[PDB]
Amino acid sequence: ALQIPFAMQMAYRFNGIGVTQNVLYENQKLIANQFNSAIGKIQDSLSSTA
Amino acid sequence: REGVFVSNGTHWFVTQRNFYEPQIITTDNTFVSGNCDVVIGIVNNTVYDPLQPELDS
Ligand SMILES: *[C@@H]1O[C@H](CO)[C@@H](O)[C@H](O)[C@H]1NC(C)=O
Ligand SMILES: *[C@@H]1O[C@H](CO)[C@@H](O)[C@H](O)[C@H]1NC(C)=O
Structure with missing residues (x-):
């Protein structure tokens, strides 16, 4: 395991889908909001959908 | 452009991600986008x- 800052791991996930890494850094707060809000929907999905 | 910025503590360099090979940072091995405020x-x-x-x- 090599440590790396998490926002730099995500940039090297983004380059792997062909989106240029500056698209992450110019939108990092927005991406954190979308990711955090998306896991909120998982808890609601599992809590509602037995 | 490809690789990571790294420093030993005072020098700044860029390397490929998978084997340490410190290049000097240049207008060729980097690309610009936007002003310094956002990142x-x-x-x-x-x-x-x-x-x-x-x-x-
Ligand atoms: C990294 O963590 C330190 C506290 O240990 C904090 O002062 C610093 O602002 C953080 N840097 C970034 C880039 O978030
Ligand atoms: C970076 O450089 C600019 C221009 O000299 C300066 O305004 C800014 O305060 C510097 N940032 C830090 C973290 O020193």
């Missing part, structure tokens, strides 16, 4: 431009 954790350092000394010829 979290950006650092102040000089980026070299190889054309400059040739126009100083």
Whole structure:
């Protein structure tokens, strides 16, 4: 395991889908909001959908 | 452009991700986008431009 800052791991996930890494850094707060809000929907999905 | 910015503590360099090979940071092995305000954790350092000394010829 090599440590790396998490926002730099995500940039090297983004380059792997062909989106240029500056698209992450110019939108990092927005991406954190979308990711955090998306896991909120998982808890609601599992809590509602037995 | 490809690789990671890294520092030993005072020198700044860029390397490929999978084997340490420290290049000097330049207008060739980097690309610009936007102003310094937006990015979290950006650092102040000089980026070299190889054309400059040739126009100083
Ligand atoms: C990294 O963590 C330190 C506290 O240990 C904090 O002062 C610093 O602002 C953080 N840097 C970034 C880029 O978030
Ligand atoms: C980076 O450089 C600019 C221009 O000299 C300066 O305004 C800014 O305060 C510097 N940032 C840091 C973290 O020192």
